[PDB]
Design a protein around this ligand. Structure first.
Ligand SMILES: *CCC(=O)Nc1ccc(CN2C(=O)N(c3cc(OC)cc(OC)c3)Cc3cnc(Nc4ccc(N5CCN(C)CC5)cc4)nc32)cc1
Length: 261
């Protein structure tokens, strides 16, 4: 009941779009705090079933994870989170900001995402849908991991997860490696020109995406570590975070900006 707020304290202002979570609004809470607001169509979830799914958002707290702010847990149910001003990392990379981002910006964003996932890792959770569409961007290039597990992606999914349902933090590490290609191509679809069926067996036959143009080989090698066949050999998010945080001193101290990266 601590998270419950009055219905009149939310003002729904702008629809954000119909993605994997239906309609989500930008709005204001208590007239003072900009927030993201989501309501559920009455019927699709009982009030008891929702509060059992609201447990995840009420216990997990990290500066790189989209923060739950409040809840209206009786139908029609409302969920309130912090608001991320720039939308999804996917839209961010494809839009007008894309042309200005270079490797220093893209690596820092990746380090932030790795930091959120390192928190998920430390908590022994799994975020089975890590990809640029599920990262939200705010001011000052702040990136936060969103979790649409309540909403209930072959090209982003580790082979053992897509084929055998072996979803672990290690398959999340595989997805992060795909996410690094979205960052370095400024949001292009991975495995360009390959259909899902084509991606499945090609990857099982050992294929991996090549080094994106102007992406340093050292960053591509990091992607390849994320895409090792045996999940146990993939690096931890703790490792990924440190490698990305330290990247331009320890790993590319001679980096020079190019035309796109
Ligand atoms: C699966 C792929 C997908 O559709 N991903 C996706 C869906 C929805 C949003 C919008 N959200 C959002 O859903 N948030 C959220 C997550 C959550 O976890 C259960 C619960 C919620 O309850 C409220 C909410 C949070 C959130 C925070 N900020 C934003 N900001 C945002 C700003 C701008 C835009 N734009 C899209 C339209 N045009 C093109 C540009 C501006 C979108 C989102 N959104 C969400 C995100 C990802």
């Amino acid at each position: 009941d601590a998270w419950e707020i009055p219905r009149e304290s939310l003002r729904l202002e702008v629809k954000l779009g119909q993605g994997c979570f239906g309609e989500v609004w930008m709005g204001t809470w208590n007239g003072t705090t900009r927030v993201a607001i989501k309501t559920l169509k009455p019927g699709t979830m009982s009030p008891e079933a929702f509060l059992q799914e609201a447990q995840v958002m009420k216990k997990l707290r990290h500066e790189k994870l989209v923060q739950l702010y409040a809840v209206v847990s009786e139908e029609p149910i409302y969920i309130v989170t912090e608001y991320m001003s720039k939308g999804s990392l996917l839209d961010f990379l494809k839009g007008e900001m894309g042309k200005y981002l270079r490797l220093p910006q893209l690596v820092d964003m990746a380090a932030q995402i790795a930091s959120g996932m390192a928190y998920v890792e430390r908590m022994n959770y799994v975020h089975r849908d890590l990809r640029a569409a599920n990262i939200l961007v705010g001011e000052n290039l702040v990136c936060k991991v969103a979790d649409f597990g309540l909403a209930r992606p072959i090209k982003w999914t580790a082979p053992e997860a897509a084929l055998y349902g072996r979803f672990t933090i290690k398959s999340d590490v595989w997805s992060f490696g795909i996410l690094l290609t979205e960052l370095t191509t400024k949001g292009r679809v991975p495995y360009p020109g390959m259909v899902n069926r084509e991606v499945l067996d090609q990857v099982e036959r050992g294929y991996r995406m090549p080094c994106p143009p102007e992406c340093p080989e050292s960053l591509h090698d990091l992607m390849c570590q994320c895409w090792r066949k045996d999940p146990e050999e993939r690096p931890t998010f703790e490792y990924l975070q440190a490698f990305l945080e330290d990247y331009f001193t320890s790993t590319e101290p001679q980096y020079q900006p190019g035309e796109n990266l």
